[PDB]
Design an enzyme around this catalytic site. Structure first.
Site, PDB file in Angstrom:
ATOM      1  N   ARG A  17       0.841  -1.220   0.000  1.00  0.00           N
ATOM      2  CA  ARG A  17       0.000   0.000   0.000  1.00  0.00           C
ATOM      3  C   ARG A  17       0.862   1.250   0.000  1.00  0.00           C
ATOM      4  O   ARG A  17       0.419   2.256  -0.554  1.00  0.00           O
ATOM      5  CB  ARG A  17      -1.034  -0.040   1.122  1.00  0.00           C
ATOM      6  N   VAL A  18       2.039   1.212   0.617  1.00  0.00           N
ATOM      7  CA  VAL A  18       2.905   2.379   0.502  1.00  0.00           C
ATOM      8  C   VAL A  18       3.270   2.612  -0.961  1.00  0.00           C
ATOM      9  O   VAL A  18       3.373   3.759  -1.419  1.00  0.00           O
ATOM     10  CB  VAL A  18       4.157   2.208   1.391  1.00  0.00           C
TER      11      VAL A  18
END
Ligand SMILES: Nc1ncnc2c1ncn2[C@@H]1O[C@H](COP(=O)(O)OP(=O)(O)OP(=O)(O)O)[C@@H](O)[C@H]1O
Ligand SMILES: [Mg+2]
Lengths: 284, 339, 230, 52, 52, 115, 115, 85
Positions: H33-34
């Site tokens: 997700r980063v």
């Protein structure tokens, strides 16, 4: 395991089995049409080969390149195949038998020239390494000699320019509604016959026009008729093989259903037991 | 998938029958109930219907006992010699309320944590719906009416999860009732609305519940659809087929097209009858194309325009005979001339 | 009624409901559940019901019990426990009913474990085996005939098909209740009569009768009367 | 025979003209029906709204 | 000319039917228009009457 | 691991696993369609995977009672040589049943002579 | 609802759902039996289904960090117009990626020109 | 629970491990997700394409098991997915 995914697989396999049954229906109907077309084609080729058979032993004879038994430097093959799958191993068996005879000639130092009437043959022999010299694909549900003439025209030119010495045709024989076999047959240099000369009946048309040119035309017709009957018979064989394969697939799909359902039933029972055990134990 | 829609359209169709209607909203969110109520007064009469409401915000006991209270209200009409129709929206949510009540009272749990007597909940709820003979209703009404026979028809609603029919509550309800209207989801997503599914949806009461003209004109629809189901699987990848099978397939496809309609448009017995007659007698056989909806609308408009007397006679009687058969033939023959 | 010396028939509208009510009572009493959620005493309660339906030195109680299988699962504990006590299985078919054959009993799925030569008699047993195998072979030839056509069949194959049609129709029977539905007076066929009729059809006698002579005709001696009029 | 061809042709042309007249007359009937029914329906719904 | 008369009769029939069709579709458009107008009229009257 | 067991042993084991995994993937295609609809390379790997599975078997001395076959002890070098030979197709010309309940690969060749 | 939204909007949504539902049933058919078993009408339907299922995708302004592309905002009228055009076949001849990760259908034809 | 908590997943599969794909990472079921923020600019730029390429490669590989001949656009993507794998 897992209930929803197994039930999804069960639905998919059910649908696939139904589709295979439908494909069997289509194959059977196409076989009916193909076999009646074969029945139409049979008399013409049969009579023409009887003609050339009596020419094999006539008197007042003269020479012709398609008639004499010349030596073999290279061999030509006219190969029929499907352009579709789901026909079992018909094409594979025919290709293997041709490969056997081509290997036999390769042992003798004799090269092979190949002309293909189907897409499967083109793919197989270009990926294996056979010298494809002619090719036509996608003939259709009703095949016609007109489109097939071209590859035969190329092979005939290869023979009549002197390069190609012996020519064969390979096809599967429609022996029965449920039985067929791959075969390799001598096509161009005239095969043997059992006779002696018939001296006289009616009139020797021969010298009304030129004998050589008329005999040329007649043998053109002969080779073309042989090729057409071979192609029609192979399509009949294709429909038979497809219907057999579809029947086998249907039975196997039913077999998978009857076992996936057992897995599903055991899974459901075990899951209900586990959840109920959790509830009762959690009451504490 | 249209459970609420089918229920409320039945209620709306009872505007002019002697059948009173009852709608029980169990666990429904409040604004949906408001929308349905406004639809009921807007598209017809809410004067004929009692609306019982128990939203998701009220106590479990109230939701649990809402369908029983509605049953009492319907049972009044049942034993007064008059007919009534009640709908139980989301019986599964009533089962949920009963589950909560039982668990908070420390009663022993069962298969899906439901109490042991959940069957005795829905069973004694539904077995109050019945048709009643004249002697019972006359003794009950103390002789106010002498020869009539009252009834209370019930249409409960159940929500399966991913279409699991073997769950505890659905299987209990399926055993209790007699006939189910099964609404499959992939037909609804396909746009075939209402998405009823033949073969799985049956009616245990049989053709004794139909009026005669609807019974005569519906026997072959069953057969046509049954043949269509199996032949259409073959249709998708087949050609050069036997023409008998070709026509069977194509007629099945168009009769499937015919049995679909807009949401808030209910259809009288005469209108349904003549449309089914057009399907069955072959007047659609040459019109087996996309126009069928417009064709039906035009047929109804034309019939309203000039052949109303048969409509009145059929709606009043539901009868069928040779003269009616020929008059229907004449109507369809005349319509084929028009747009 | 058994103690009066009679042979009684006990009809159970649904045994699955008896089992399920046992589960409900056990849950109300609070006892721990077993298997797929059933009562801990399922086998005992089933045995208590079934062990009383037996033949005594005087009188007997034969029982017909309607069976429903949950989720179509033949391994589910209620079907599995119930089948341990059934001696015979009768299956009713919508397909047989659609043909107009009544009673609509499918002969291929219905079985009885009395059907052994040393139990029923060698003649009756071999007759039953012949009928079952012939009907099975016809059920396969029906698929073949649909897919290819009747031109493929041989004369032996054709004869098997014809005899199978005659047998299928001879299975039908007019009931006394069927008088009001059909007008046929209704008949009662003895065991030796039906064995003789099916033996005759299997061994080639009455191959010269039409297949409609056997429909709803009762005994074979009345089939020949119908064929005489027909 | 040519005389017969001309006679039948004229009959068919006149028949087509008559059918056109009838078809367009039914079109006009449909138009009048739609217009006046729309007017009546509009008034019915309006009166219902004020009653509400 | 016999076959040309056949074709002319069929063409005239279909042309007349299409010319009826345009009337029908125009009437449908008009019905939608007038129903919308009446709905707006009655609805605004509802608002102001109930407010007052 | 190649650092402890050697690179040839490691490569042979990983090749065996790869071939058998591919065979597992092909089984579900074969179950419905049969063997005819496969690619030629897929048929080759099917044949070699079946031969590998047969070659994994071995008649133990302690099992001589249940069977009748004499027992066999196989060295590591022999077994890695045999599986390396099968993987690279040196023994494509032998039937499958030659590899069943044999010791070293030489024994399989001898069995194939008598079929 | 055809009453709440434009009647056009309702029909467009219903048609898209019908087409994609028809594709899902054919997924396993094609997967096992092959693409060319289909009829030409079925193959047309397959093409339009894949194009439609591409046109549902979209880049977001807040999903710009993950992918490396600008964000797109499409008006409702443009969405209806694009899906109506795709279903009616006005863009049958464009490839599948010409609809993937674009905005309005005008942007689809611009990217098709670039393709 | 743990899947619900973390900012990403890296899935290791027995099938991939036996097939010889080691490390046995399955793209399309594993995400970060980063995302691109957790990379050097060069790695961000280059990895952007790889992520979509492999995921759609597997779809094409499943969709075209039996078509002997194929459109060479899909052929290019199929061969390129094989290369990247
Ligand atoms: N014949 C129809 N034509 C068009 N839309 C329809 C039709 N029947 C139902 N719908 C639509 O289906 C949707 C769901 O309807 P409905 O609420 O009756 O379904 P349901 O299965 O009872 O749902 P739930 O359990 O979520 O309340 C609504 O948007 C409704 O407009
Ligand atoms: Mg609803």
């Amino acid at each position: 395991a897992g209930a929803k995914d197994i039930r999804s697989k069960i639905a998919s396999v059910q649908n696939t089995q139904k589709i295979t049954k439908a494909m069997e229906m289509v194959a059977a109907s196409k076989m009916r049409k193909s076999q009646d077309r074969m029945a139409a084609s049979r008399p013409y080729a049969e009579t023409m080969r009887k003609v050339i058979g009596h020419l094999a032993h006539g008197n007042l004879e003269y020479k012709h390149p398609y008639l004499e038994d010349r030596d073999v430097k290279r061999v030509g093959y006219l190969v029929v195949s499907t352009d579709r799958g789901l026909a079992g191993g018909l094409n594979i068996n025919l290709f293997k038998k041709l490969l056997a005879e081509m290997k036999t000639w390769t042992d003798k130092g004799v090269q092979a020239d190949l002309a293909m009437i189907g897409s499967k043959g083109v793919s197989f022999f270009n990926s294996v390494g056979g010298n494809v010299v002619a090719q036509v694909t996608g003939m259709g549900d009703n095949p016609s000699l007109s489109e097939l003439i071209g590859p035969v025209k190329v092979m005939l030119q290869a023979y009549d320019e002197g390069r190609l010495d012996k020519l064969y045709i390979v096809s599967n024989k429609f022996i029965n509604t449920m039985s067929q076999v791959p075969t390799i047959s001598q096509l161009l240099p005239l095969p043997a016959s059992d006779d002696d000369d018939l001296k006289h009946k009616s009139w020797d048309y021969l010298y009304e026009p030129d004998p050589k040119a008329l005999l040329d035309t007649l043998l053109r017709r002969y080779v073309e008729s042989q090729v057409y009957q071979g192609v029609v018979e192979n399509l009949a064989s294709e429909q038979a093989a497809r219907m057999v394969a579809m029947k086998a697939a249907t039975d196997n799909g039913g077999s998978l259903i009857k076992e996936l359902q057992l897995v599903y039933n055991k899974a459901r029972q075990a899951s209900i037991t586990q959840e109920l055990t959790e509830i009762v134990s959690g009451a504490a | 998938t249209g459970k609420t829609a089918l229920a409320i359209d039945a209620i709306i169709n009872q505007r002019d029958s002697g059948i009173k209607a009852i709608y029980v909203a169990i666990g429904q969110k409040a604004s949906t109930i408001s929308n349905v109520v406004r639809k009921l007064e807007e598209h017809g009469a809410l004067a004929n219907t009692i609306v019982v409401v128990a939203t998701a915000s009220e106590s479990a006991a109230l939701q649990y006992l809402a369908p029983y209270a509605g049953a009492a209200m319907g049972e009044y009409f049942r034993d007064r010699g008059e007919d009534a129709l009640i709908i139980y929206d989301d019986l599964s949510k009533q089962a949920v309320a009963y589950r909560q009540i039982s668990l908070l009272l420390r009663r022993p749990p069962g298969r899906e944590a439901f109490p042991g007597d959940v069957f005795y909940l829905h069973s004694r709820l539904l077995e109050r719906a019945a048709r009643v003979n004249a002697e019972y209703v006359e003794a009950f009404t103390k002789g106010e009416v002498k020869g009539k026979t009252g009834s209370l028809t019930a249409l409960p609603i159940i929500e399966t999860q991913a279409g699991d029919v073997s769950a505890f509550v659905p299987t209990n309800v399926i055993s209790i009732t007699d006939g189910q209207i099964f609404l499959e989801t992939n037909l609804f997503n396909a746009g075939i609305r209402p998405a009823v599914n033949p073969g799985i949806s049956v009616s245990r009461v049989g053709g004794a519940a139909q009026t005669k003209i609807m019974k005569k004109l519906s026997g072959g629809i069953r057969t046509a659809l049954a043949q269509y189901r199996e032949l259409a699987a073959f249709s998708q990848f087949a050609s050069d087929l036997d023409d008998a099978t070709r026509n069977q397939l194509d007629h099945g496809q168009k009769v499937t097209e015919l049995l679909k309609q807009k949401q808030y448009a209910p259809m009288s017995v005469a209108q349904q009858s003549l449309v089914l007659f057009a399907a069955e007698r072959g007047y659609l056989a040459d019109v087996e194309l996309s126009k069928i909806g417009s064709f039906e609308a035009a047929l109804l408009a034309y019939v309203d325009r000039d052949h109303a007397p048969l409509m009145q006679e059929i709606n009043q009687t539901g009868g069928y005979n040779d003269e009616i058969e020929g008059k229907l033939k004449g109507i369809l023959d005349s319509f084929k001339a028009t747009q | 009624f058994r103690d009066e010396g009679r042979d009684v028939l006990l009809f159970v509208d649904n045994i699955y409901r008896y089992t399920l009510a046992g589960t409900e009572v056990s849950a109300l009493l609070g006892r721990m559940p077993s298997a797929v959620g059933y009562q801990p005493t399922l086998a005992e309660e089933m045995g208590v019901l079934q062990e009383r339906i037996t033949s005594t030195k005087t009188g007997s109680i034969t029982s017909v019990q309607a069976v429903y299988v949950p989720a179509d699962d033949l391994t589910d504990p209620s079907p599995a426990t119930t089948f341990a006590h059934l001696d015979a299985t009768v299956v009713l078919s919508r397909q047989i009913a659609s043909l107009g054959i009544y009673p609509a009993v499918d002969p291929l799925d219905s079985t009885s474990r009395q059907l052994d030569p040393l139990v029923v008699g060698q003649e009756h047993y071999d007759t039953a085996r012949g009928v079952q195998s012939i009907l099975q072979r016809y059920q396969e030839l029906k698929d073949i005939i649909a897919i290819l056509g009747m031109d493929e069949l041989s004369e032996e194959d054709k004869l098997v098909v014809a005899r199978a049609r005659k047998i299928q129709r001879f299975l039908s029977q007019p009931f006394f209740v069927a008088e009001v539905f059909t007008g046929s007076p209704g008949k009662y066929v003895s065991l030796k009569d039906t064995i003789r009729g099916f033996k005759g059809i299997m061994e080639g006698e009455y191959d010269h009768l039409p297949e409609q002579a056997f429909y709803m005709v009762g005994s074979i001696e009345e089939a020949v009367e119908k064929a005489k009029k027909l | 025979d040519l005389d017969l061809a001309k006679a039948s042709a004229t009959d068919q042309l006149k028949k087509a003209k008559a059918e056109a007249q009838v078809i367009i007359e039914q079109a006009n009937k449909r138009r009048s029906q739609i217009l006046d029914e729309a007017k009546a329906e509009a008034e019915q719904e309006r009166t219902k709204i004020v009653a509400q």
